[PDB]
Amino acid sequence: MKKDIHPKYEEITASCSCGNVMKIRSTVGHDLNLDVCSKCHPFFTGKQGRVDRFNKRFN
Amino acid sequence: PRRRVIGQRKILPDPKFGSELLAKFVNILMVDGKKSTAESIVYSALETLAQRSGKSELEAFEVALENVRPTVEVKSRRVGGSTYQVPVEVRPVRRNALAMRWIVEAARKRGDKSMALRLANELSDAAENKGTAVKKREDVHRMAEANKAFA
Amino acid sequence: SATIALNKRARHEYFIEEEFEAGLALQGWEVKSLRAGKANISDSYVLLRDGEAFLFGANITPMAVASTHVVCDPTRTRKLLLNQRELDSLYGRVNREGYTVVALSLYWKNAWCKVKIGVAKGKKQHDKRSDIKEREWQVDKARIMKNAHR
Amino acid sequence: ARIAGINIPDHKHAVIALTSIYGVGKTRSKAILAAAGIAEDVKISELSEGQIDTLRDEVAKFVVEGDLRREISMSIKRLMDLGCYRGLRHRRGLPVRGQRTKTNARTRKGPR
Amino acid sequence: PRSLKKGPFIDLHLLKKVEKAVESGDKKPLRTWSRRSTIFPNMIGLTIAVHNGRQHVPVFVTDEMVGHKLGEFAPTRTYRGHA
RNA sequence: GGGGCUGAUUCUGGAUUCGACGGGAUUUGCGAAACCCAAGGUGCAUGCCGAGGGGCGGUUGGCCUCGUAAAAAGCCGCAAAAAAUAGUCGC
RNA sequence: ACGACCAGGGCUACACACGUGCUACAAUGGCGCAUACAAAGAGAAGCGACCUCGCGAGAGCAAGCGGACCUCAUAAAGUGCGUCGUAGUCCGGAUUGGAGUCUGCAACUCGACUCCAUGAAGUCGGAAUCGCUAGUAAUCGUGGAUCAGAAUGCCACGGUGA
Ligand SMILES: [Mg+2]
Ligand SMILES: [Mg+2]
Ligand SMILES: [Mg+2]
Ligand SMILES: [Mg+2]
Ligand SMILES: [Mg+2]
Ligand SMILES: [Mg+2]
Ligand SMILES: [Mg+2]
Ligand SMILES: [Mg+2]
Ligand SMILES: [Mg+2]
Ligand SMILES: [Mg+2]
Ligand SMILES: [Mg+2]
Ligand SMILES: [Mg+2]
Ligand SMILES: [Mg+2]
Ligand SMILES: [Mg+2]
Ligand SMILES: [Mg+2]
Ligand SMILES: [Mg+2]
Ligand SMILES: [Zn+2]
């Protein structure tokens, strides 16, 4: 790389609510607290009449 | 009017000071026919002014209302047909009758958290001939000095 | 090298209430009439039709540069236009009684040809009294200058 | 005070400070925060952090800020299925609550 | 809507033919003029042709329609659009 | 008849009539003509024979219907002149 | 048959304009809950004192007055002090969302009425400017009318009140 015009690029932590934590290289400095990870990506993991309510609510 | 000239009905006073001026002042300080907390606003302004300028109410209120009085004042009569704003005299009834209104036209502009809190300052202003009611008096006396020759 | 046109013989005739500043759509062979100063806005009143306003009757004359031959017509139902939030309510104003809306001036601002718009009232009219208030104001102020000074 | 992260002007009562929080307002929140232990007239002043955070499940047992906008979005999606009177008046550009639209409907129809 | 303790209102002999429709399950489009009732729970997926003033409009019933009425399905507001 | 001048206040240059109109792009939702499979719902069913239709006629050679042979449809012509405010006035 | 009967629909249509008016744009104040205080009428194919389930709209079975007697029904604006305390906001309540009640052969077109959540413009309005001389104008209800059901209307009465 060139020595001058690229910012400071170090590894920061990243924890998510799927159990899969990863620490990788970014630009900020603090823990990028993740929303959703690639396994908990709801592809095969999320998508994996009220007649009875009519009789439920009254008869 | 035309047929029967009428003289006004007499004056019934207000509780704290019995003052026939301030009883007519609670009526211009009355909106929607409610005297009730309107006079609480009156006695709130009377709490603030008669502590931020010394003397007891029944005289010390009168200083700013003396100072915002008019000497000559303008109206329209179409002396031409344009806006030749004709200056004219005033009866001493109408003197105070619009002098108090020049206080309430400033009361409709202040900005505290309560309108009873709002009126702490206008009479202590116009005692020193400052404020906004004296800006109204300065406007009408400016127009009086402007259109003086129209007699 | 032409200046601002006019059709002044309407303003002291109708009633003018609220004013709007239209555009046009010139339709193929007849624009340099306005560029030279040849015009006729005589009895030009916008008949509102189909939500799509037209000028009719106006004899914008053909030029002589463009051969006078395969030119368009002097009179044509020329499709006027104007912004939707300004157009889409005036139907309720104009569609009631013996009202039309007229043209006023084929002027041009912003290097661009225009036409003005204003709602009108009627002609079956004793159209006297505000041509009477002028001589019941001028003579009155002369009389009262005479009275106040003299 | 603090529910579902969406922060607010803090020095209000929580029961109406959660009115940017789409889901709790002037009546329901009077019981919602009373389940935590603070009533509906007291602000955030001298209110401890634990006494704030005892509500993060009590609201979550009901409809929360991120919940209600999506709830009425998916519910108007479901009610936009068929094509009844509420299948053409919700799409032509009219109100649906059954009122005169020959005058004064411009809340739905458009600012004049 | 209506108060919910009622038990909603349909025609008597057309309820009899709803019971004939549960008895049969046949697939005939019948010319039909009823509009003042609800798409019931037990009238799943049989097609008829309902009154709308002058023509006759087909409607297909749905088991997701047990709260509405059967009178919105016939627009008698003569509307082709504005202009 | 040849020759010159004039062809948008840009005249070697770059439209912003913000101006509802015709054509194109983006955001958008559920109907099959914007799209598809037979499991989640379901019975005497599909089609080729053959046959028929709003005081009256027509079209997709065809839209509702019919089983050893005949009764019922959305839109178009004959017709409610379906000009509503009519163009600027008095008769 | 320009006659008469029957099932629904429509008069409430929609980008408009023209009116008649009401709660709004706030701090006299919506906000707290009991509290200082009345008139006027109306009710038996109806009005309804109860108890309780109803803090939500209603009520099941039912007690009384054909009414100076049972009612509609305790006035709100008046007051104790404090909150959103000058914010498009706890203003301000409309487009919506499900959830519930009523009367009614039948509340979708086409009814109010309710739960709870929601919060679009609006910040004293250019010109045509209109009403009013004292209990007047502004401002707060309460009842009758048609009516199974419902009035920001029209009909009256009562407080404050320039
Ligand atoms: Mg809320
Ligand atoms: Mg609430
Ligand atoms: Mg009928
Ligand atoms: Mg009508
Ligand atoms: Mg009237
Ligand atoms: Mg009654
Ligand atoms: Mg109870
Ligand atoms: Mg109170
Ligand atoms: Mg306070
Ligand atoms: Mg509000
Ligand atoms: Mg709610
Ligand atoms: Mg707004
Ligand atoms: Mg404001
Ligand atoms: Mg009089
Ligand atoms: Mg009736
Ligand atoms: Mg009644
Ligand atoms: Zn994921």
Q: How far is the CA of A37 from the centre of ligand 3 (A)?
A: 65
**Dist. CA C9–CA C16, nearest whole Å:** 13
CA distances from E22 to C3, E45, E60 (A): 84, 10, 16
Six-digit token string for B126: 């116009």
The helix (H) or strand (E) run that includes residue B44 is helix B38-52
- Closest by alpha carbon to E63, among E49, E43, E48, E47? E43
Boundaries of every domain in chain B: 20-147
* B116 touches B40 (CB < 8 A): yes
* D78 touches D18 (CB < 8 A): no
* Complete DSSP assignment for C13-60: TS----EEEEB----SS--HHHHHT----TT-EEB--TT--EE-S--P
- Closest by alpha carbon to B104, among B129, B136, B63? B136
Residue B140 three-state SS: helix
- Closest by alpha carbon to A12, among A21, A20, A26? A26
* E30 touches E15 (CB < 8 A): no
Please tell me which of the candidates E4, E7, E66 has its beta carbon nearest to residue A51. Answer: E66
> Strand E30-32 and strand E47-51: pairing?
parallel
Residue D97 beta carbon within 7 A of nucleic strand G: yes
Q: Which nucleotide is nearest to C64 (CA to C1')?
A: F7
B72 Cβ partners below 8 Å, 6+ apart?
A: B87, B88, B89, B90, B144
Distance from CA of E49 to the nearest CA of A (A): 23
Amino acid B139 reads D
The correct answer on CATH 1.10.8.50 for the domain covering D2-65 is: yes
Q: What is the CATH number of domain B20-147?
A: 1.10.455.10
* Complete DSSP assignment for A11-46: EEEE--TTS--EEEEESS-S----S--SSSSTTSSS
Beta bridge pairs of residue B133: none
Six-digit token string for A32: 């990028």
Among all bound ligands, the one having the nearest atom to the CA of D24 is 1
Q: Which nucleotide is nearest to E27 (CA to C1')?
A: F43
C96 Cβ partners below 8 Å, 6+ apart?
A: none
CA distances from B100 to B34, B61, B115, C144, E74 (A): 19, 11, 17, 36, 68
* B55 touches B127 (CB < 8 A): no
The helix (H) or strand (E) run that includes residue E59 is strand E56-60
State phi, psi for B49 to the nearest 5 degrees: -70, -45
Write the DSSP symbol of residue E5: T
CA distances from D90 to C104, D87, D95, E67 (A): 43, 6, 7, 18
The helix (H) or strand (E) run that includes residue E18 is helix E12-24
Six-digit token string for C43: 């009895």
CA distances from B61 to A29, B23, B70, B110, E52 (A): 67, 14, 18, 19, 79
Six-digit token string for B68: 């915002």
**Count of other CB atoms within 10 angstroms of residue B46:** 20
Distance from CA of D12 to the nearest CA of E (A): 39
D15 Cβ partners below 8 Å, 6+ apart?
A: D24, D26, D29, D30, D32, D33, D40
CA distances from E57 to E18, E30, E52, E71 (A): 20, 12, 6, 12
Q: Closest residue to G86 by CA to C1' distance?
A: B113
**Looking up tokens 């041509």, which residue turns up?**
C131
Scan residues 35-74 of chain C and list those with Cβ within 7 Å of strand F: 35, 43, 45, 47-48, 51-53, 65
Residues with CB under 5 A from ligand 2 (ion): D 25-27
**Dist. CA E63–CA B81, nearest whole Å:** 80
Write the DSSP symbol of residue B144: H
CA distances from A26 to A12, A30, B8 (A): 7, 10, 86
**Looking up tokens 């104001």, which residue turns up?**
C137
* Residues counted in chain A: 59
Q: Which nucleotide is nearest to C108 (CA to C1')?
A: F17
* Complete DSSP assignment for D1-27: --STT----TTSBHHHHTTSSTT--SS
Task: State yes or no: chains D and A have 3 or more CB pairs below 8 A.
Answer: no
Please tell me the experimental approach by which this structure was elucidated. cryo-EM
Six-digit token string for D94: 């009219």
Q: Which nucleotides of F are covered by protein (CB under 7 A)?
A: 6-10, 15-21, 29-31, 41-45, 64-65, 73-75, 85-90
Identify the domain containing residue A31 by its residue range. 1-41
C138 Cβ partners below 8 Å, 6+ apart?
A: none
